[PDB]
Amino acid sequence: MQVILLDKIGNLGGLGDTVNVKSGYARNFLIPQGKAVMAT
């Protein structure tokens, strides 16, 4: 799942950086807590 980082993450990347993540990571952590968003 491609996601836009709304903040800096340890390994993923920096704010505004697009990265593929596992859908669990996005669904269950990054997106719910506002650390990223769906890269529509």
Binding site: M1, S23, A26, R27, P32, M38
Partner: protein
Amino acid sequence: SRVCQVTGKRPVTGNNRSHARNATKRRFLPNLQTHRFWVESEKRFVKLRLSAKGMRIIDKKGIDTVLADMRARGENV
């Protein structure tokens, strides 16, 4: 019932087929799972009984569109 709230996928019927081609009736159940989706607009979790396919659909369409669709169908969500 074993019915996906997002898709409508329900248990379908088919055959088991041996090497000897004996057909016994069987069912094919949807890979139903329960998952709590946080819905921002309503500032709540909503627990859905949905297929794993249903989850993929919510990942593409987002929960808000899917909840809308469901409520129209008369799903209690």
